[PDB]
Amino acid sequence: MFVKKGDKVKVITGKDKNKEGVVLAAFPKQDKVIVEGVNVVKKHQKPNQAAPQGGILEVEAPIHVSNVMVIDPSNGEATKVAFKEVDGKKVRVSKKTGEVL
RNA sequence: GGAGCUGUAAGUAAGCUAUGAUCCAGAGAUUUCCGAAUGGGGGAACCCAAUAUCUUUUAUAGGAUAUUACUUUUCAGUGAAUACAUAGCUGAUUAGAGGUAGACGCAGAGAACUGAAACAUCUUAGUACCUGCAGGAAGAGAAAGAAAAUUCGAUUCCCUGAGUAGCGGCGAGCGAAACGGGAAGAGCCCAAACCAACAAGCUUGUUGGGGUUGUAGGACUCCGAUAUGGUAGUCUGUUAGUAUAGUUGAAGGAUUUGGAAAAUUCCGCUAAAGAGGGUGAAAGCCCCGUAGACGAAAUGCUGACAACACCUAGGAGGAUCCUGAGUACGGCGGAACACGAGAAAUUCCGUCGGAAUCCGCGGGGACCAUCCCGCAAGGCUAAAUACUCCCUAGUGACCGAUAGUGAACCAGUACCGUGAGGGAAAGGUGAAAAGCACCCCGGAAGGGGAGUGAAAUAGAUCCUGAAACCGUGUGCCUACAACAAGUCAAAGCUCGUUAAUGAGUGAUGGCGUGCCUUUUGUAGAAUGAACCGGCGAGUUACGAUUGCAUGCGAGGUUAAGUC
RNA sequence: GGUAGCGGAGAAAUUCCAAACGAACUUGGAGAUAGCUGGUUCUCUCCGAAAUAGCUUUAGGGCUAGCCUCGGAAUUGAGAA
RNA sequence: GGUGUAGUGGUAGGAGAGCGUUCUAAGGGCGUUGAAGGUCGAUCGUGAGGACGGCUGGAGCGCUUAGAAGUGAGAAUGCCGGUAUGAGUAGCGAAAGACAGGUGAGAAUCCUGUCCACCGUAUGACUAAGGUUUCCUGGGGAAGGCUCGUCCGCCCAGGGUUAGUCGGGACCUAAGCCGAGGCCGAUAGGCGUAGGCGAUGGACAACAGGUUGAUAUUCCUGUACCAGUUGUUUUUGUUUGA
RNA sequence: CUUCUAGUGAGAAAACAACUGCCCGUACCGUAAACCGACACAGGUAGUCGAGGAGAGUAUCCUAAGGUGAGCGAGCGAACU
RNA sequence: UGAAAUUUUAGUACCUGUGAAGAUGCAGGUUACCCGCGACAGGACGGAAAGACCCCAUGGAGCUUUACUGUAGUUUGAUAU
């Protein structure tokens, strides 16, 4: 996928539109990704999970990769990603600015 | 290729990964046992060996490795009745077995139902089935031809000839070929005569040279040339390309509704990319892609180049020699030719008889003569043609879960049968499991809250949720009535609609024997339907003919085929 | 263990051959053939029969004619009462 | 378009004109401000049929023109599915059970006890075939059990089959079968010699007791036997040679 | 298996000690609810043992060892079968 | 605990008559308050089996013979070996 673990991304669709967070986990096979503080769900968990209350836990659920855009670290704004080889190494490049990664 | 990964498949647990994992492509290694199965056996996936080497034990037992089936080819050694020998036996060597792709090809053998309105000739049909052999194609193929326009010049396939010529209990039916137009195109090798070498027993076998034909050719004898061209040869190299992974690949933000925007509105932007797919609803500009550009370490495949290899001669004379024998052909009996013995050619098989050979031979649909055409009894040969089990990329006025493959799902499965064999049913929560923590009744199941969700009457028998069938509640009617159940008339009561000279129910009165099929005639005591739902029957191809329509009109029109 | 369907076996009954044997079972030819029975799905408008003759291995089938329907041509109008 | 005249039952069947369904093309549209579909309504047309509104539903679908058909079902003792009727009816598959206690949410049906009753050339004890885990232990009550079930030959989880001597193989053969060469035959193959396979037969060394929840001539105890190897000792033969 | 020689032969035999001896089956049901009958089916299923009194007896009745009370019951005590 | 055959929908009387000639359903008259339970079997030409008897089809099959046409075998001759 064009987005990678640890990236800073902006949500461009969904209830969490315009939010921005770091990518916590990536699932290329599902073409999905998890962004901290994005698409949080209340989950009714029995206490069988080493938590002696079970409770209603809060966890981020994956969102489709197409619904996020990588944040330009140099500019702080979301942008599309091109691929340019720099000094013999292929890297991602911001189409808005040209900055790497 | 660059960040996750340890399948479906969650879960725990333990781990791997920028020292580049998982993943993708080429090559390679390992690849238990059964299975042609092949050391022997055997009720497949098991059992028991011999030989040689190694290994465990003090040693026997035990373990590993290698070889050991049958037949064919070749060689060698041994070796009977029997003397020589052969046969047998031993060893080595060589190449076969079996399966497929339910397809396509060739051949052996080869039905019946059916049609003929019966049936035997005939037709179904040389089809179905069985068997052998194959190749990527096969088969055919280089004239003892087609013709008689005078010519053509291997074969195959297509259009046409033509439903014609013909065949046929002259019935039912079967049914050509040549000419013409096209796809593709290619020609070559022996036997023989003759010469040389070799061995034996002047000829007689092997090898080599020579020769490959019908306007006759070759040998042979003279001359002159030792060239000119070609190939349907090679794991020979070089080169180019291509197949099998990949890389790159433009352009959008807000606004309104909404859980969610791609939808609406407003302004923009890209296009060699507005094919398509996905994304929380319908996206040219979010993602995967698309147009375009680029890319191969390794192995295949193709084409070119070279290399090697192999074919390649002209003219003149005939005196003689050669030019495919148990063959051609004939009788008899069958069969194939559209042609069923018919006047019957031509071709093939079985049996018997049985030629000529260049002044020769065969054919031109009995046969003879003339003329014309050709030269059998030897072999090989690419392309055009046939088919798709498979792999890749696509396409569809093709199906959309009773459809479409039997099989969208762990299907040739479950199940049935001794066996061959027969053969199902079964797709959909939600955008996302966020798959209902906690509480209450209950032993649980299952519910009621409370929560998740936009929606839970989307709660896993989960999208939608029809009808039959069942049940609850009730507006009206019903216990003196004989009812194909309705229809026409109608009081009463109840209710207020697509606002219509309304709706529901209905005491009571009149009339009135279902639907379908098949019948002269059916309410029929003739037939069929238990009910509901789904599925379920004049279609297509090629021809004939008529109507209608269009174009052209004494003209009309192309078929195959090429782009 | 042997005998297999154009067959086997039969102290013989058409008796048995995997719960139906005057010719087993399965697959294929195959969608056998059926002058026979059954079924054949929407609507309205115009018109509207026949159950007869002849022949038929023909009689509950078929063919021609007769009767119906649609289109067309032409007439010194030929039809009906 | 108007007036007039006439006509307008109908099976087989002929002619004409239309409705509706799926899909294709073009144009023009409609849809999370809710499509298709479902359901209700007292709506429109001459007919097949067409709208409109409410509710349900949640993503596709009309309209006009033309085109193509797997294009219309009520019947085929049609096929498949579902559900009725008979009907809370037949049946619940040879026979003896009773009570007390226990367990349990729950007991005629499970466990224990007592009495009673049944079989006893069997309904007892061994075994071959066959079945193939049904055996034991601990749980369970969804489904199966013709009732019930706390229970089971059911379901879940673990566990269980110990051989020189028993049966079979490393032993033998009968019938039958296979069959090197071979004989025969359109193909395929048929038959068959040597040689093998093949028991239901022949040959062959261990028995008693004990032990577990489940195995026992298998494990253990005791005492044996059969075949063989190494070693020690004592014998005796070394080629007129055991 | 026992003999006979043919062949083969330098080592054999006895006692004792120690040691070796492979593969498959082994559960369970088995005149049945576990097999064949679609069923937890009144049928079929080879062989062995199969006691006592009376008795010829494995007949018959009642019993031993041992096993079992049959997988719907409770009432009532009509017709009819 | 829990089926089945059957089943066009049924609010499912009698007599006489009528009718495809043997009516629960049609005509006339008569009878009959509504719903059941236990019994019987006259009818629903009751259910079950597309009658086997009879006829028909230019159907099938098995069998017979001095039906027709063939044919395996058997035999005889010519001919090849």
Ligand SMILES: [K+]
């Ligand atoms: K084998």
Ligand SMILES: [K+]
């Ligand atoms: K194929």
Ligand SMILES: [K+]
């Ligand atoms: K025939």
Ligand SMILES: [K+]
């Ligand atoms: K006929």
Ligand SMILES: [K+]
């Ligand atoms: K060829």
Ligand SMILES: [K+]
């Ligand atoms: K023709």
Ligand SMILES: [K+]
């Ligand atoms: K005829």
Ligand SMILES: [K+]
């Ligand atoms: K030459």
Ligand SMILES: [K+]
């Ligand atoms: K998106």
Ligand SMILES: [K+]
């Ligand atoms: K798109």
Ligand SMILES: [K+]
């Ligand atoms: K290459």
Ligand SMILES: [K+]
């Ligand atoms: K002929």
Ligand SMILES: [K+]
């Ligand atoms: K010629």
Ligand SMILES: [K+]
């Ligand atoms: K829903």
Ligand SMILES: [K+]
């Ligand atoms: K009601």
Ligand SMILES: [K+]
């Ligand atoms: K009335």
